[PDB]
């Protein structure tokens, strides 16, 4: 009904500048306020600067006048951002939002996100990890599988082999210096391990990658 | 300008509650034009109280538009269910906005028990390329608002502590992971290294060494 289309993700390197785009739909464009706000991964919001769609003018935040240039398209009513050659610092999930009269918003998009990674597609290095903390060897032990250092963000992985539901977590991953890190996690309890054996599977699938490495204790 | 609003917080689905929002700068006058925006399942954030109190068009008439006194106040009256949410807060500094780091709310579905913590080792395999990684697995925890502290013998870590948000597993409870990375050496003179983690104001803690 009234939408308003932002794209889905995007992958800009260090010192390549990007151009961003909200459509706007189903309302009249220029008689409504434009925002646009950062979402840097997961703490806090930052609004950015304000276009307005009839008569252009913008104000920016302090923050991100070196940055941004908002710009409009009146006939497609799309409503484009774009910043100036940015630092591994600024990868983050871009909003744009409309407002009528003093409001982030009544609408925002779904909000695109622009990873900033200059290093390209490459294979996880899963390293075994063994429940030898702090805590007596008592009724279910906890295991898991760390797979590091992984581009793009895409790792889809089963633990053995594909049958053991009944104790599993994957994380949700992060990212250390422009490439991802992820572990998954297993809590099976004492008669099953070592004994009835615990290995994971590593699927990853852009750069091939279907590795199947073994737990033990070290 | 600071706009601090609330960290985090719970109601049982019925009872009302008060959100508020003060700012660093004095007291939030009418000036301020203020704003309430939410996020919810998947990245989606509808607006909600425009001005101090207009309601967004579709906001239900429960939530109220109130600057209560010196602090702009949102009310979620009849609290439910469908407002389990993280919402932020927005103050109009004359000539620019600044947003609250929002507050998530909890609607008290399955009570409310611990994290069942287990911290991992460095494995000896990243070890040859000098690398020596750590997983504090936190997990099972309601609600959504756990802390991760993390001490390398005693010491307090301000060394480069890496962490998850809260994702919802399988029965509508929450997990969690805290990534601490260092390289050998930064591992082996080293015994105790410490991970604290709480809910509603109630630690837990675990440990690994090396003598
Ligand atoms: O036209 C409108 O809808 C109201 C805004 C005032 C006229 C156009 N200029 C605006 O300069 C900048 C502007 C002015 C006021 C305001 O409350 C916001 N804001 O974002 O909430 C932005």
């Known amino acids: 009904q009234v939408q308003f289309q932002q794209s889905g993700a995007e992958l800009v390197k260090p010192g390549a500048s990007v151009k961003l785009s909200c459509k706007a739909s189903g309302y009249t464009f220029t008689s409504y306020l434009m925002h646009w706000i950062k979402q840097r991964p997961g703490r806090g919001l930052e609004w950015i600067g304000r276009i307005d769609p009839n008569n252009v003018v913008t104000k920016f935040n302090e923050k991100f006048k070196s940055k941004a240039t908002l710009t409009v398209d009146k006939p497609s009513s799309t409503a484009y951002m774009e910043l100036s050659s940015l630092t591994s610092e600024d990868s983050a999930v871009y909003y744009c939002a409309r407002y009528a009269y003093c409001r982030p918003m009544d609408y925002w998009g779904q909000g695109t996100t622009v990873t900033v990674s200059s290093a390209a597609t490459t294979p996880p290095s899963v390293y075994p990890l063994a429940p030898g903390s702090a805590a007596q060897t008592n009724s279910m032990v906890t295991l898991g599988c760390l797979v590091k250092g992984y581009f793009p963000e895409p790792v889809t992985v089963t633990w053995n082999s594909g049958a053991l539901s009944s104790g599993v977590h994957t994380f949700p991953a992060v990212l250390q210096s422009d490439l991802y890190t992820l572990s998954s996690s297993v809590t099976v309890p004492a008669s099953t391990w070592p004994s009835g054996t615990v290995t994971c599977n590593v699927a990853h699938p852009a750069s091939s990658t279907a590795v199947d490495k073994k737990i033990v204790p070290r | 300008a600071v706009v601090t609003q609330e960290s985090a917080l719970t109601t049982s689905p019925g009872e009302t509650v008060t959100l508020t929002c003060r700012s660093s700068?004095?007291?939030?006058?009418?000036?301020?034009?203020a704003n309430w925006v939410q996020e919810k399942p998947d990245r989606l954030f509808t607006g909600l109280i425009g001005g101090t109190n207009n309601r967004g068009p579709g906001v239900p008439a429960r939530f109220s538009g109130s600057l209560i006194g010196d602090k702009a106040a949102l009310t979620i009256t009849g609290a439910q269910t469908e407002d389990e949410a993280i919402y932020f807060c927005a103050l109009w500094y004359s000539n620019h906005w600044v947003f609250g780091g929002g507050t998530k709310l909890t609607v008290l579905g399955q009570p409310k028990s611990s994290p069942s913590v287990t911290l991992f080792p460095p494995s000896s395999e990243e070890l040859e390329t000098n690398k020596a990684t750590l997983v504090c697995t936190i997990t099972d925890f309601y609600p959504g608002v756990v802390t991760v502290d993390w001490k390398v013998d005693g010491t307090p870590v301000t060394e480069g502590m890496e962490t998850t948000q809260p994702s919802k597993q399988s029965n509508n409870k929450y997990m969690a992971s805290s990534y601490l990375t260092l390289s050998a050496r930064a591992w082996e003179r080293h015994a105790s290294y410490s991970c604290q983690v709480t809910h509603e104001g109630h630690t837990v803690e675990k440990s690994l060494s090396r003598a």
């Open positions: 700068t004095g007291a939030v006058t009418t000036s301020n034009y």
